[PDB]
Each structure stands twice: as C-alpha cells, then as structure tokens.
Enzyme design. Structure first.
Site, PDB file in Angstrom:
ATOM      1  CG  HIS A 152       1.535   5.437   4.067  1.00 34.45           C
ATOM      2  ND1 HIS A 152       0.391   5.177   5.614  1.00 34.45           N
ATOM      3  CD2 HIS A 152       2.485   4.508   3.946  1.00 34.45           C
ATOM      4  CE1 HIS A 152       0.528   4.443   5.863  1.00 34.45           C
ATOM      5  NE2 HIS A 152       1.474   3.945   5.281  1.00 34.45           N
ATOM      6  CB  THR A 201      -2.346   3.163  11.217  1.00 39.67           C
ATOM      7  OG1 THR A 201      -1.958   1.255  11.190  1.00 39.67           O
ATOM      8  CG2 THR A 201      -1.620   3.608   9.760  1.00 39.67           C
ATOM      9  CG  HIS A 233      -0.123  -0.035   2.490  1.00 43.97           C
ATOM     10  ND1 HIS A 233       0.128  -0.780   3.264  1.00 43.97           N
ATOM     11  CD2 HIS A 233       0.476   0.888   2.689  1.00 43.97           C
ATOM     12  CE1 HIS A 233       0.528  -0.909   3.947  1.00 43.97           C
ATOM     13  NE2 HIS A 233       1.165   0.796   4.076  1.00 43.97           N
TER      14      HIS A 233
HETATM   15  C1  7R7 Z   1      -3.195  -5.316   9.748  1.00 44.82           C
HETATM   16  O1  7R7 Z   1      -2.039  -4.967   9.081  1.00 44.82           O
HETATM   17  C2  7R7 Z   1      -1.066  -4.203   9.121  1.00 44.82           C
HETATM   18  C3  7R7 Z   1      -1.918  -2.366  10.216  1.00 44.82           C
HETATM   19  C4  7R7 Z   1      -1.488  -1.551   9.805  1.00 44.82           C
HETATM   20  C5  7R7 Z   1      -0.463  -1.584   9.219  1.00 44.82           C
HETATM   21  C6  7R7 Z   1       0.362   0.135   8.898  1.00 44.82           C
HETATM   22  O2  7R7 Z   1       1.804  -0.353   9.403  1.00 44.82           O
HETATM   23  C7  7R7 Z   1       2.617   0.420   7.884  1.00 44.82           C
HETATM   24  S1  7R7 Z   1       4.224   0.446   8.637  1.00 44.82           S
HETATM   25  N1  7R7 Z   1       1.399   0.649   7.227  1.00 44.82           N
HETATM   26  C8  7R7 Z   1       0.409   0.865   7.230  1.00 44.82           C
HETATM   27  O3  7R7 Z   1      -0.839   1.177   6.973  1.00 44.82           O
HETATM   28  C9  7R7 Z   1       0.366  -1.977   8.078  1.00 44.82           C
HETATM   29  O4  7R7 Z   1       1.126  -2.325   7.444  1.00 44.82           O
HETATM   30  C10 7R7 Z   1       2.792  -2.461   7.416  1.00 44.82           C
HETATM   31  C11 7R7 Z   1      -0.116  -3.369   8.509  1.00 44.82           C
HETATM   32 ZN    ZN Z   2       1.823   1.419   5.426  1.00 45.12          ZN
END
Ligand code: 7R7
Ligand code: ZN
Length: 258
Positions: A94, A197, A92
């Site tokens: 940001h 997050t 993903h």
């Molecule tokens: C439930 O799984 C998740 C939850 C949050 C994150 C956040 O941490 C980062 S880094 N970017 C994100 O959106 C994730 O990504 C690894 C995976």
């Molecule tokens: Zn992320």
C-alpha cells in the site's frame, strides 16, 4: 462490489457493503509506542523463506500482488505470537501519492511512504479460503517503507510494473527472493486484527516490524505509475491505496523488544 479508494467508493463508504468495517478488531491501527507492552512470553520469530517459489505478479485494480506456490511448506512464518505454521501465499504493498503518506499502520501517528504485507495462512485450515473464516487464520508481516536509499532487493519488482500497468494484467514472476525485502531487525509489534480492504475479515494476527526498509524516490515513483483502471479506460493513477487507522477498542499491542 465496487469498492476502491476514491471520494465516492473509499474507506468511509465500505461499511455499507461490509458492516464488519465498524467491528471490534479492525485494521490498521495506530501503534502507540509508549502504550505497547514488552511481552517476554513471545517466542522467537522464524521467517523461513529459503525455498520460496514466486510465480506471478498481478495488478488486481487495488494493488499488485506477487503470488507464491503455497501447495507445500516452501516459505513459512512461525514463532512469535503464532501457534503452528503459516504459509506464504502473496505479498503486496500500500502506498501514497506523496512520500509523507501511504502506510496503513502508523507509529505514534507517523505515516510512512508505503507498507509491505507478506500474507501467510494457517496450514491447520487446509486452504486460504477456509483460513480467512477463522480468527487465527492469517499472519500478515507488515514492513514500513521510507524514502531514502534504494532497496536492491525491490528493483526486480519495480522493473516488471511497466508490464502490469492496468487492472487484470499479470506477468510471469519466477525466482524472486522475498528475503531481499526484510530489514536487518525482526523486532516487532503484534496485535489481533483484520484485512485492511473488503471483505475486512477479522482473521489476522498482525506482526508489524519496527525497522522500516529504505526505498528510493525513483522506486516508489514507479509504484505511482500503475493504474487502478483497466486497459482502454480513463486513467486513474494507483496511489493512496491505504485505509486509515481504525479504533483500537479492547485490544493490546505487544512488543517483542524492550
Ligand atoms: C483475498 O485475499 C485478500 C483480500 C484482502 C486483503 C487485504 O488485507 C490486507 S492486510 N491487505 C489487503 O490487501 C488481503 O491481504 C491479506 C488478502
Ligand atoms: Zn495489504
């Protein structure tokens, strides 16, 4: 939990529901390029994505995730600072409302227009949910995006976004090759950190590539047309879904390159 990126539920509020927000290995951080130390002990980084099997793309109300089949070692990350095998589960981004902001990590306080996270879990823990409870459970490969020339390898992602505008929408997304998102060089910085997050778990070995990829203004503009809200709710554009830099505290950032 009603966390997000607005004035009323943004990063400054997260600590009330998620006290680890003020913990000792939070991410992202500023990478001070003059402080980060070349580490000759780092083994070569191995990105093995030739058998990657993408499945679906999902707007989860925070970002859009391209999900992979992680039921076998199809696409893995090994080497560098990592012990063992980390399996790709999703990627993903940001991004910002403006080209001058959007990344989570910064480089000498420089913000990039966006940041790609390729998320991998340590296969010694058996599943992703177990891995996030371990200090070495995840390896996130972070790649900065700058606005310039179009990234051809991104355009299949850009073109499906119209079909996942709002929170909870998904679309089939097969045969996408994540190798088309990598820069030429795999030179990187590494440090121990967290999810950026909620739930902000301190389970990530960060591997942040030095070389950004270039995307076009038109490509990033299409990211900014997504919505945080669900269908039939008031439109809130999915922009500025980044957490600012957090205190480094008692950590060292290591460089793979001289
Ligand atoms: C439930 O799984 C998740 C939850 C949050 C994150 C956040 O941490 C980062 S880094 N970017 C994100 O959106 C994730 O990504 C690894 C995976
Ligand atoms: Zn992320």
């Amino acid at each position: 939990h009603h966390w997000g990126y607005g004035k009323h539920n943004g990063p400054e509020h997260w600590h009330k529901d998620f006290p680890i927000a003020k913990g000792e290995r939070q991410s992202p951080v500023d990478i001070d390029t003059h402080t980060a130390k070349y580490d000759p002990s780092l083994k070569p980084l191995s990105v093995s994505y030739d058998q990657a099997t993408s499945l679906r793309i999902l707007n989860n109300g925070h970002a859009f995730n391209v999900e992979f089949d992680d039921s076998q070692d199809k696409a893995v990350l090994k080497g560098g600072p990592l012990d063992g095998t980390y399996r790709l589960i999703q990627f993903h981004f940001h991004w910002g409302s403006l080209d001058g902001q959007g990344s989570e990590h910064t480089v000498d306080k420089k913000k990039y227009a966006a940041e790609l996270h390729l998320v991998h879990w340590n296969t010694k823990y058996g599943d992703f949910g177990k891995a996030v409870q371990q200090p070495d459970g995840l390896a996130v490969l972070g790649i900065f995006l700058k606005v310039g020339s179009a990234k051809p390898g991104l355009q299949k992602v850009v073109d499906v976004l119209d079909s996942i505008k709002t929170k909870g929408k998904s679309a089939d997304f097969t045969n996408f090759d994540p190798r088309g998102l990598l820069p030429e060089s795999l030179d990187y910085w590494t440090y121990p950190g967290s999810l950026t997050t909620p739930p902000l778990l301190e389970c990530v070995t960060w591997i942040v590539l030095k070389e950004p990829i270039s995307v076009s203004s038109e490509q990033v503009l299409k990211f900014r047309k997504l919505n945080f809200n669900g269908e039939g709710e008031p439109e809130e554009l999915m922009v500025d879904n980044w957490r600012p830099a957090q205190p480094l505290k008692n950590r060292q950032i290591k460089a793979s390159f001289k």
